[PDB]
């Protein structure tokens, strides 16, 4: 029922904060692959940003959105200021692990993965 | 008559009892605004009254401090300023009102 808000009154203002955050990220992205000698392309980086944004699309609560904005800002700080490293940024792509196949059979054959 | 407060960043106050009277009186002058049923007023008023009694009854600091039970008169003065600011912030807050919102009945229960 009724609640006490955080940094927003409605999902519209929340979404415009989100869009400001996306502006910031999208713009900064290439400076990272430049500063730290990442192998990936800016296209890959931007697709990854889009993926990590749409991962939290079903969200509806202005508060649950403001907190995600806060955390994304923390990450962007850690990134533009070179506190993270090649390792922490490449920990997004999972270059050294195969995923659980999204196939009942590919699961059954090897393990009890349900 | 004193070279050092014994502490750091506390300059000796060559003009004591005067800033004391001033600050205590300007505290009273804002406690007046507070309603009578306010415990903050009810209490701090008599606090300042006893302290004013002490300062106006003893001019010597070596015997005024031992009766105020505080530390050095500069620290008493710092506390008086803090109290004045606390009153100015109280008057804008509203502690003398009733409670805002009671909590669930299982909140301050220990153990659970």
């Amino acid at each position: 029922t009724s609640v006490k808000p955080i940094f927003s009154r409605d999902l519209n203002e929340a979404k415009r904060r989100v869009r400001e955050l996306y502006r910031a990220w999208y713009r900064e992205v290439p400076n990272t692959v430049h500063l730290m000698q990442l192998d990936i392309t800016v296209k890959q980086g931007r697709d990854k940003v889009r993926e990590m944004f749409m991962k939290n699309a079903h969200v509806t609560d202005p508060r649950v959105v403001d907190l995600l904005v806060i955390k994304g800002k923390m990450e962007l700080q850690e990134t533009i200021k070179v506190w993270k490293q090649r390792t922490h940024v490449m920990r997004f792509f999972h270059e050294t692990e195969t995923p659980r196949p999204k196939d009942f059979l590919s699961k059954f054959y090897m393990g009890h993965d349900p | 008559l004193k070279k050092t407060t014994g502490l750091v960043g506390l300059a000796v106050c060559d003009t004591p009892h005067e800033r004391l009277t001033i600050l205590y009186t300007k505290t009273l002058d804002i406690l007046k605004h507070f309603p009578k049923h306010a415990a903050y007023r009810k209490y701090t008023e008599q606090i300042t009254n006893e302290k004013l009694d002490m300062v106006k009854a003893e001019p010597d600091v070596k015997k005024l401090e031992a009766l105020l039970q505080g530390g050095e008169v500069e620290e008493v003065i710092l506390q008086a300023e803090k109290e004045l600011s606390l009153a100015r912030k109280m008057l804008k807050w509203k502690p003398w009102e009733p409670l805002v919102e009671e909590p669930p009945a299982n909140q301050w229960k220990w153990p659970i």
Binding site: I6 | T44, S85, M90, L99, E101, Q107, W108, P111
Partner: protein, 206 residues
Amino acid sequence: RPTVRPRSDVTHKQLSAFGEYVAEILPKYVQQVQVSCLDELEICIHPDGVIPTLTFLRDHTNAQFKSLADLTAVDVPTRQNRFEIVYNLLSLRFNSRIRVKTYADELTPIDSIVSVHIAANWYEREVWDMFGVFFFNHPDLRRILTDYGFEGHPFRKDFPLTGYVELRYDDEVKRVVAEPVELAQEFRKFDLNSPWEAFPAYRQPP
């Protein structure tokens, strides 16, 4: 007796009187004052009285609770407001200590007190990093104890002890990669709690 701890009632008296004092000055922002067997004074309050109460205790002439000994949080996941918040405060003019508690949850932040005590600048960051609790009007609020890309609040009661990821060096990419957690000896969960009641004084009713 030689094996039991002494018991002085003067402190209980002083602290109950000061509890009444504080509570009748702030009938608002106050609830559940209590002084315990071991002579320690707790005051529970509403999240809207943090700065009021801290300022009162620090500046008020009778209180002079200047030092912020500690700031802490505590996770009890069986109550709607699960994150207890605790300020342990010290006064030297009286040689006294006090505890001020409030409550919070996820999505329901608390007000920062760096204006009152500047020590909190790091304690509040630690609380945010460990229990996941936001603070309003904090200049910098960011991971302090955890790694830079860590996703989680590990001092909760639902976050697993060993975590969700694990690090190792891989020659292919020449970096310290993260991966799921695969242990060679699963931590053993010893069920110790006894079936027989040990303290009747705390016996809950059915």
